Design a protein around this ligand. Structure first.
Ligand SMILES: CCCCCCCCCC(=O)O
Ligand SMILES: *C(=O)CCCCCCCCC
Lengths: 16, 574, 167, 574, 168, 15
């Protein structure tokens, strides 16, 4: 596993 | 989204005031639609629905008024599945292979050449919910020959939401509203605040459908992948789908299997105020903080609050202290109406002076080896009123600057749970060069926009209707606005136009109270009722919003028929 | 026999008055479509997963929403697989009688306006003559209702769910 | 892109006429920059370079003039690699393992918080070129335990291009120009058309760097994966990397290894005309089609020509026959200047009457069960001149309509190679409902854009400079325009604005001839010289383009110093 | 031994560079291109050098469309570092005639001259003049740019796919 | 190999 490759998704409903 | 519930001690009258302020879409099917439903012997409800929804989701009746803001509480989890060797479409469970329910789906698709041809693939369910391609999250999370991943959303099995609004639409008091919420525990992804007639206490709750996992469980059940990805998905249970002791739990007062029980979900009653601006349940009321609720609901005093949260609570406190420049010290319908549109800017109020003292002497700079003349920027910002009103000058310069300030080591006074409105603070002197870099860029961006540094905001921030630009006020939560008018349009591309698809902004607004003669409600639907540019209701409401003229919405039969623009028509059929 | 009185006041705010829940549904579905036909008709392609048929697989969703703007083809797969006939059945089975009546009216109110926009009028010139402005069913409204519930979970991972495939 | 080379027979005079018309970017580093380079006793050349390039790529000198269009000839290929088991970074060559060359690359990357951190990954080269991730092309084409994929571009080893233009810049005749092109065989991805002073014939060629594969190789070397995906990569060799016999070939007269030899690349000399509008070499001249060149160059008489190619050749022929409504039958400098901006619309000229005849009686319709008034649409289109000139009324309706017509058996006369300009043709009467569906939609789009159906094109199609919308003319190749002004903006988003990043459009234009007194060139740089909004040269050239006023670009010393806007200064340093 | 170029401008600003040698022609040409298009160019030299992400963040797309299309900064950076390596530049330069190597050195020097001017003051290029990525370049960087132009028919079209090719 | 999961790349330089 390589954390540098992680793409956090946006999890705020209605947000950006 | 913001909301306030003021209680009778705050208003000094017989009932409280509800302020509902969802920050939401200006276009599309999720946009709000304002209407009243009068059903003989059943309901008299007014407020707002998503387009395509048949009951009122945010509004009021003769007896209660409520609103919603998106809650920090996570509403889903992942399940890591250990696949049967040789069989990628099957997963192990306590030692037994369990097959994934398939579904072969064919979707007709129009081709760029005009002809229509079929596109087909087979997708799968686990018992937890649908399979999910997590390669996007991280390439190591691909559906291998060894492991797969499925997502569960507790709302995927929540069939109680419509009835719950339906019953709220009918509710005859705050106590009844509360009991319905507790009975149904159905609220899918939002907080709730409500005020009732003759009731002294305002109501806050994050009482709804929420995954149920224990601290012992997340220690034992989180996989090595779930660990390595845990920070990208804060408080999202990323569990072992092979062991059943890892299934979501069910409390003795739990309404739905795998969901948190009613007594372990945060709520609060106050006679002064409750409020929420998208941070956790923690600070529903600043004077009486909420703690001791499941992790999944979000941080309870361990994270800095957003600038907007700091602004929203600050506004409430200063109203009740009588220090916000409005009359007296009560949260009356009339004052609340003005207050919520005032367009104060938290970052500017708290940090502008410090920034300017730090970087403006001298105002002639060397930034990235380049001569930069920041004298006009410095003077304009010093002169500016720290607001985003239509006639506020230089406010957009601040927006382009602040949104660009690096936040690593920006403050020297770190967040303190004992002082959540005033921390973090103290602009770091070591940040001076970076601040000058950001300001240099901001100046340049306003430069290409064609606007002057000291332009009034109303010329920068606008909505176009009938060929005319209506001046707007407010801004984005990142600058610590409470009044939200947040364009997605780059300043260089024609200013802060609200004509496209803006970011979550003031949409349906309501200030509701209960004087002796019956519910009064003052409302906005900022983008107007109709999406058709030919309709006379495409831009009328937007003109009122621009002018800051709250609509007193008629509610009683006498009010409806006595309205200056009253029209009626009947529609029948079968 | 649905019958609703529609009262309009300043800014067009409609005030539906009916004797029963079904007829309230009727009046409410009518006014929504009357004011927002193109957004709504486009939205029913969405929940039914019929976007690609009319608008092309590779095109994005027209409007932003709790769904974001994924490709038509992926949205279509998402909604069919998650908002399946079984899910809609299961949803409906749990509903009280008056609410099932309301949704019925609502679909029928919507369909009434659709006929009217098809017949003529200068309203909704953007889309009134398009194939995807068409009647809908009570189930299709239930699709919409269920869809709004998933904003916190499935909706955020629509592209991802539609492309979950074994090696 | 378009270009014409007119011979002396066609001009009537002692020299030919060159028309250069690359359709290219309006913004970005690949945009053209117009300039003249005068190097003491060595070169005097004028024309255009990409930004960042030091020699002229499209231009002219006192002796030759030339231009380029993107060629149909493929310049790359894929190689499928048979991986060594247990070693996914090695591949087999005739049963011999070969190591892939690794490169560990670290890139610093700015994080959203302001700080900069290193991101690193090891990438690989094969003896064919870089390794490539084809999972996006098809997920079955991933880099697996046994299979990898590399890409070879013949220009990866082509170090001759810059040198070639430089030698062209200095060339003293067409003869020399041609000999240079042949010697270097370097032109990386474009056709070339040139005209010389004192030469009767105009030159066309696709002579440059092109991967060399045989018919035998294509059948034997294309892999099952190559077979399966060839349809999405037409004419692209997708070969077996395991077999040395599948390496690219080298002819006896190849300038570069693995590239097509000079004698097997298409060229033609004509004293009437040559032209290209992005179709294959085939119809460089309609009277003398070219055939028998390697398949990689594209089809030669098996494929229908694009509408733009049909327009371009039609314009050429109608000029020389004297039937296009300009004076005489000669391709003189002044007449070419007009015709190339004429803005004729091929789809309309050929199929509008057929379309209208078919669907406009009656003009009141039922489409998708809906009443549609098409009387305005039908009348506006009938009256429309079939051109996209500034004052052309209704042309945008046609754009919105034609681009939406389904082409699945739209035509009843299929493409014929003996009638390549006029086939396919003949509107299928059965398409009647589909055409009315297309027209209904077009009406609706123009409706919601705010433009009237008969609005003049110049109000719809524009470039903004100094806050004023300069009216434009021309359109998109899809409609069969030759004069290309093709916006990326949807008509509902404020018309066909050219202010963003439009699709390939008229950029640098030149009309060059060689009268007795010396070369004469008339030019446009449509978007203007400077990207800086504050520059005097941000919008001046654009204003001239809007007015259709070709610039006589000064070339001699006396012309430069005699120019009304002449300014000189000298820069120097150690 | 000095670069020296006469810059003659006419209608529409069209520059006519007059020089005694190729180096000095390059100098004048590099200067005028920068004078008119600094922000586009400075941004472009990040692309070819693979230094976009450092300045503009890895997940943003290229600002401008080109033969490269508009991939993400991070991937563009790896593409260019990988394909337009130092070895690729060395090989490109080795094949050049002396006069062109001098022209490109002149060109970089001229570009750098205008960068010193923009940095010093004035109202031109107000959009980017104070940014860190407006900076001097080398002859090698111009060669990077030249090599990049040749790749449009092949590698440029698969930039993102080349940047992400790795074994399991 | 499912031909319907194929996504054609950009192949026209400038298009
Ligand atoms: C499923 C519908 C959820 C509740 C409706 C309220 C939506 C408001 C969202 C927000 O607070 O920004
Ligand atoms: C139109 O399709 C082609 C125009 C682009 C030509 C670019 C100049 C030659 C550089 C290789």
């Amino acid at each position: 596993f390589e954390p540098g490759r992680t793409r956090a998704p946006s999890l705020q409903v209605g947000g950006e | 989204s913001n909301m306030y519930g003021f209680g009778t001690a705050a208003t000094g009258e017989g009932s409280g005031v509800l302020f509902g302020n969802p920050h939401w879409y200006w276009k599309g099917p999720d946009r709000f639609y304002q209407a009243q439903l009068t059903i003989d012997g059943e309901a008299n409800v007014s407020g707002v629905s998503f387009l395509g929804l048949p009951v009122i989701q945010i509004g009021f009746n003769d007896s209660v008024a409520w609103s919603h803001t998106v809650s920090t509480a996570r509403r889903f989890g992942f399940f890591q599945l250990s696949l049967v060797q040789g069989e990628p479409t099957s997963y192990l469970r306590d030692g037994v292979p369990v097959k994934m329910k398939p579904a072969t789906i064919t979707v007709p698709s129009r081709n760029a050449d005009g002809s229509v041809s079929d596109v087909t693939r087979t997708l799968y369910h686990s018992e937890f919910g649908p399979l999910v391609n997590l390669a996007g999250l991280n390439p190591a999370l691909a559906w291998s020959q060894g492991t797969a991943f499925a997502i569960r959303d507790i709302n995927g099995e929540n069939f109680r939401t419509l009835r719950t609004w339906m019953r709220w639409n009918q509710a005859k008091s705050l106590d009844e509203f509360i009991a319905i919420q507790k009975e149904e525990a159905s609220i899918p992804w939002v907080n709730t605040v409500a005020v009732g007639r003759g009731s002294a206490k305002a109501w806050y709750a994050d009482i709804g459908a929420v995954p149920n996992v224990s601290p012992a469980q997340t220690a034992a059940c989180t996989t090595p992948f779930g660990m390595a990805v845990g920070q990208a998905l804060p408080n999202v249970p990323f569990f072992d789908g092979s062991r059943s002791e890892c299934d979501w739990l069910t409390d003795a007062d739990s309404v739905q299997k795998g969901a948190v029980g009613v007594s372990r979900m945060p709520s609060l009653q106050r006679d002064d105020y409750v409020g929420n601006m998208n941070d956790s349940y923690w600070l529903a009321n600043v004077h009486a903080p909420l703690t001791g609720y499941p992790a999944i609901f979000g941080p309870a005093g361990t994270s800095a609050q957003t600038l907007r949260t700091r602004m929203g609570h600050t506004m409430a406190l200063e109203r009740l202290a009588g220090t916000d420049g409005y009359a007296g010290n009560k949260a009356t319908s009339a004052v609340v109406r003005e207050m919520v549109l005032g367009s104060r800017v938290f970052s500017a109020e708290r940090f502008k002076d410090e920034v300017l003292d730090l970087i403006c002497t001298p105002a002639q700079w060397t930034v990235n080896g380049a001569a930069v003349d920041a004298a006009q920027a410095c003077a304009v910002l010093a002169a500016w009123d720290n607001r985003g009103r239509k006639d506020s000058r230089g406010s957009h310069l601040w927006d382009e600057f602040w949104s660009r300030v690096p936040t690593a080591s920006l403050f020297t006074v770190p967040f303190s749970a004992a002082d959540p409105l005033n921390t973090p603070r103290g602009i770091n002197a070591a940040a001076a060069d970076a601040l000058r870099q950001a300001m240099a860029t901001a100046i340049a961006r306003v430069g290409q926009s064609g606007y002057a540094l000291d332009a009034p905001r109303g010329e920068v921030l606008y909505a176009t209707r009938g060929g005319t630009r209506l001046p707007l006020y407010g801004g984005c939560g990142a600058m610590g606005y409470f009044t939200i008018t947040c364009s997605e349009n780059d300043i260089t591309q024609g200013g802060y136009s609200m004509d496209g698809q803006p970011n979550a902004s003031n949409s349906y607004m309501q200030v509701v109270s209960f004087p002796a003669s019956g519910v009064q409600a003052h409302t906005f639907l900022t983008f107007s009722l109709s999406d058709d540019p030919a309709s006379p209701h495409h831009g009328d409401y937007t003109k009122a919003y621009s002018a800051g003229q709250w609509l007193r919405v008629p509610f009683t039969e006498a009010e409806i028929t006595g309205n200056a623009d009253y029209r009626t028509a009947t529609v029948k059929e079968l | 026999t649905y019958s609703a009185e529609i009262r309009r006041t300043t800014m067009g705010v409609p005030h539906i008055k009916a004797g029963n829940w079904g007829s309230a549904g009727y009046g409410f579905g009518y006014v929504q479509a009357q004011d927002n036909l193109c957004t709504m008709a486009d939205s029913f392609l969405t929940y039914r997963g019929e976007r690609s048929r009319h608008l092309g697989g590779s095109a994005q969703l027209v409007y932003n929403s709790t769904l974001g703007r994924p490709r038509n083809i992926d949205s279509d797969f998402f909604h069919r697989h998650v908002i399946s006939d079984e899910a809609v059945d299961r949803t409906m089975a749990a509903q009280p009688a008056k609410l099932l009546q309301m949704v019925e009216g609502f679909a029928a109110g919507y369909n009434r306006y659709v006929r009217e926009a098809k017949a003529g009028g200068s309203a909704h010139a953007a889309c009134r003559s398009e194939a995807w402005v068409q009647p809908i069913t009570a189930r299709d409204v239930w699709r919409r209702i269920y869809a709004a519930n998933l904003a916190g979970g499935y909706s955020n991972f629509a592209e991802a769910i539609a492309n979950a495939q074994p090696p």
